[PDB]
Amino acid sequence: QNISPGAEPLILNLSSNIYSSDITQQIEVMRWNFFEESGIPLPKIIVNPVKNNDSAIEFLLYQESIYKDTLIDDTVYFEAGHAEISFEFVQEKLSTNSIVYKTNKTNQQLAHLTGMDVYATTNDKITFLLKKLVLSNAKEFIGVQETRYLMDIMERKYNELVKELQRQLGLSKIVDILQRLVEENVSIRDLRTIFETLIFWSTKEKDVVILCEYVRIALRRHILGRYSVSGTLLNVWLIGSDIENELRESIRQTSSGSYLNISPERTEQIIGFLKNIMNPTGNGVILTALDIRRYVKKMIEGSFPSVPVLSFQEVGNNIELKVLGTVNDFRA
C-alpha cells in the first residue's frame, strides 16, 4: 500500500515485441547525447516493455500520455532534408513540431542517394522518435531542481561566479532566463558564458527579454553555428517595419498577446502573409530587429513553427549571410 514515488517518473510503454537491453542502452545514449547536444542532462526514461503491445509504443510523461502508435518497421523515419524528400518520405508533424519523414522502409534506394544513415530502423526510430518527442519537448525539463543542480555542477569552474549569481540574481532570475533561452533550443554547453554575461549585465538590466537577447548576442557564435550551413547563414529572409509600424508602437507593458497585438485581425493578416512564407521550404531564417522576436515566434507558432528565427541585433557581424529575400509583404 505505501507506494511512495512522490512525483511520478518518465515511462516508455515499449512493446515487448521489440524489447532489448539495447534500447535501455540507447536511452542512456540519448540521455547523454542530450547532455552533449543541448548541454542539458536527461532524467532516465524507464523502459516498460509492455508484454502484449502490437508493436504499440506509448510514452507517458509522469504519466500523461504524449504519444502512441504501432511501431511497425516497414516504415522508417528519414530526416535527411534532401531535395528527393517527397511523399515517399512523408514529412509528418509531431506535436513538438519535430518533423518525421515517414518513408517506405523499402525505398532505401532513394535514401541511398543521400544521407541514408538517418533511415531509421526499429531501434533508431525509437531513439530518433524519442528525440523528436522528448528532447524536442524542451524547456519542460528546466525546473528548479535541475537548475540548481546545474548551479552546483561547475563549482569547480569558479565557484565565485556561480556563487555571485546565487548571491546577486537568485534562482528566479536565473531560471527565468534559462527557460527563455531554451526556447530557441540554445545548446547550453558553455553555461559559463551565460553566467559570465549575466553577473554583470543582469545586475544592471531588469528586462527579462533583453536579458535573454543580450545573452543571445553573447552566444551569437553558437547561434550562427546553429544555422551557418555551409559556412554562411543559410536562407536568410527579412521581416521589418511592417510589424514595427503598429506592433512596436503598440507595445503595452501588458505581457499578454496584447503586449503587441493590435487586434486578432492584425495577427490574422500577418499570418495570411506568413502563408506567403518567406522561405517556401520553411528552412529559416527570420531575420528581424526585434527584442520582441518572441512575438514573431508567436507569429510563426501559428502555423509555421518549423521556421528558425534570429534577431537583427543578433546578426552575424559581417558574417557571410545568404540573404535570399524579404517577405513580399507583412504590412497589413
How far apart (Å, rounded) are the C-alpha atoms in residues 77 and 72? 11
- CB-based contacts of 164: which residues, under 8 Å, 6+ apart? 199
One residue of 102, 139, 148, 266 binding a copy of itself per CB under 8 A: 148
Residue 156 interacts with a copy of itself (CB under 8 A): yes or no: yes
Q: At what angle do helices 208-218 and 170-181 cross, to 10 degrees?
A: 60
What single-letter DSSP state applies at residue 202? T
Query: Closest approach of Cβ 319 to a copy of itself, in Å?
Result: 10
Query: Closest approach of Cβ 219 to a copy of itself, in Å?
Result: 9
Q: Residue 19, SS3?
A: coil
Residue 37 interacts with a copy of itself (CB under 8 A): yes or no: no
Read off the C-alpha cell for 37. Answer: 547536444
Quickly count: other Cβ atoms within 10 Å of residue 71's Cβ: 19
How far apart (Å, rounded) are the C-alpha atoms in residues 198 and 194? 6
Footprint on residues 258-297 left by a copy of itself (CB under 8 A): none
One residue of 94, 108, 158, 238 binding a copy of itself per CB under 8 A: 158
Distances (CA, A) of 79 to 23, 124, 129, 133, 181: 21, 12, 11, 14, 25
DSSP codes joined into one string, 221-261: HHHHHHH-GGGSEEEEEE--HHHIIIIITT--S--SGGGT-
Query: Closest approach of Cβ 125 to a copy of itself, in Å?
Result: 21
Q: With contacts defined by CB under 8 A, name the span among 56-64, 125-133, 238-246, 267-275 that binds a copy of itself.
A: 56-64
Residue 28 interacts with a copy of itself (CB under 8 A): yes or no: yes
Please say which residue, 77 or 141, places its beta carbon nearer to a copy of itself: 141
Helices (H) and strands (E) in the chain, counts: 12, 11
What single-letter DSSP state applies at residue 66? E
Residue 153 interacts with a copy of itself (CB under 8 A): yes or no: yes
Q: What is the total count of residues that contact a copy of itself (CB under 8 A)?
A: 47
Residue 229 interacts with a copy of itself (CB under 8 A): yes or no: no
Query: Closest approach of Cβ 57 to a copy of itself, in Å?
Result: 16
One residue of 11, 118, 154, 323 binding a copy of itself per CB under 8 A: 154
How far apart (Å, rounded) are the C-alpha atoms in residues 23 and 49? 10
How far apart (Å, rounded) are the C-alpha atoms in residues 173 and 164? 13
Quote the radius of gyration of the chain (alpha carbons, Å): 22
Residue 312 interacts with a copy of itself (CB under 8 A): yes or no: no
Residue 298 interacts with a copy of itself (CB under 8 A): yes or no: no
Please say which residue, 10 or 76, places its beta carbon nearer to a copy of itself: 10
Please say which residue, 3 or 83, places its beta carbon nearer to a copy of itself: 3
Footprint on residues 115-144 left by a copy of itself (CB under 8 A): 143-144
How far apart (Å, rounded) are the C-alpha atoms in residues 271 and 330? 8
Footprint on residues 164-203 left by a copy of itself (CB under 8 A): 164, 171-172, 175-176, 189-192, 196, 199-200, 203
Please give the order of strands across the beta sheet that includes 10-13. 46-47, 10-13, 56-61, 64-70
Residue 97 interacts with a copy of itself (CB under 8 A): yes or no: no
Interacting residues toward a copy of itself by CB under 8 A: 1-4, 6-8, 28-29, 31-32, 35-36, 41, 44, 61-65, 143-145, 148, 153-154, 156-158, 160-161, 164, 171-172, 175-176, 189-192, 196, 199-200, 203, 221-222, 225
